[PDB]
């Protein structure tokens, strides 16, 4: 009378075998809603920082993609001012075969290796002045992601 087996399985697996550098906790009211913290990847300008992310599994999951957004301000070519994430598998390249775990490490990989080429000012800054873009990313990490 509750959630589909897959969601129960994925929920319980997130809490039992956590992705390294990624914490995930269930919402206290919504069993499809999760509060995620991703550590800034080693050797990235986000290293040392912790970034809040929120995840929601819609009714049509896994036919429909999970919904994911940053809640911590971050300077990154694939993340906008409201925290929305541009990642293929969150829309276009989503298939039921993928899982929540795949999404989380992909986002983590995005932080480890930003893709300025993605069809914004941030991404454009990362192309023409990568050094300054990286130091700006580090600046915002100091300002927004250390508490």
């Amino acid at each position: 009378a509750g959630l589909p087996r897959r969601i129960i399985k994925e929920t319980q697996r997130l809490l039992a075998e956590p992705v390294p550098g990624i914490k995930a906790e269930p919402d206290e009211s919504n069993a499809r809603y999760f509060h995620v913290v991703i550590a800034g990847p080693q050797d990235s300008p986000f290293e040392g920082g912790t970034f809040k992310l929120e995840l929601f599994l819609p009714e049509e999951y896994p036919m429909a993609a999970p919904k994911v957004r940053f809640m911590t301000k971050i300077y990154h070519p694939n993340v906008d001012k409201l925290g929305r994430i541009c990642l293929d598998i969150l829309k276009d390249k989503w298939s039921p075969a993928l899982q929540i775990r795949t999404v989380l490490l992909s986002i983590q990989a995005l932080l480890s290796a930003p893709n300025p080429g993605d069809p914004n000012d941030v991404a454009e800054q990362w192309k023409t002045n990568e050094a300054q873009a990286i130091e700006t990313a580090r600046a915002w990490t100091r300002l927004y992601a250390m508490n």
């Binding site: 919402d27 919504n30 499809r32 809603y33 929120e54 929601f56 819609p58 009714e59 919904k67 957004r69 940053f70 809640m71 301000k73 001012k81 409201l82 925290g83 929305r84």
Partner: protein
């Protein structure tokens, strides 16, 4: 059923605001485009024809608190208006006087609130009210 969490519901309303609805006589958007909390919104209502509100654009502030959309948003007019349910000195919308707010359901939205206020502008008790000069705004 399945509840869509606040932040994701507000992202849906954000996208719908940008696409616009109907004849565009109401519209809404984020007050601050860097507000990751999605809390403060700007509403716009075009005063309806054949009322004392006609040909006037009304700006509003809509605040979606931590329990939105389980709880109704707070609404106030920036543009001065004489209208039942709207505090004539402050612009604040008295929820008990506006049925969408007094009988709030979590299926409602910023859009619905603005459409209701526009509909109420056409009511017999409002459409004939003498208005303040065009362009005036409340303080605070």
């Amino acid at each position: 059923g399945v509840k869509v969490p606040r932040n994701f519901r507000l992202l849906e309303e954000l996208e719908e605001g940008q696409k616009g609805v109907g004849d565009g006589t109401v519209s809404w958007g984020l007050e601050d485009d860097e507000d990751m909390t999605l809390t403060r919104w700007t509403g716009m209502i075009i005063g309806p024809p054949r009322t004392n509100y006609e040909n006037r654009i009304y700006s509003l502030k809509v605040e979606c608190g931590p329990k939105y959309p389980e709880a109704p948003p707070s609404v106030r007019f920036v543009t001065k208006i004489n209208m039942n349910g709207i505090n004539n000195s402050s612009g604040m919308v008295d929820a008990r006087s506006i049925p969408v707010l007094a009988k709030w359901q979590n299926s409602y939205s910023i859009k619905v609130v603005l459409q209701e206020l526009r509909r109420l502008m056409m009511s017999k008790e409002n459409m004939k009210l003498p208005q303040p000069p065009e362009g005036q705004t409340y303080n605070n």
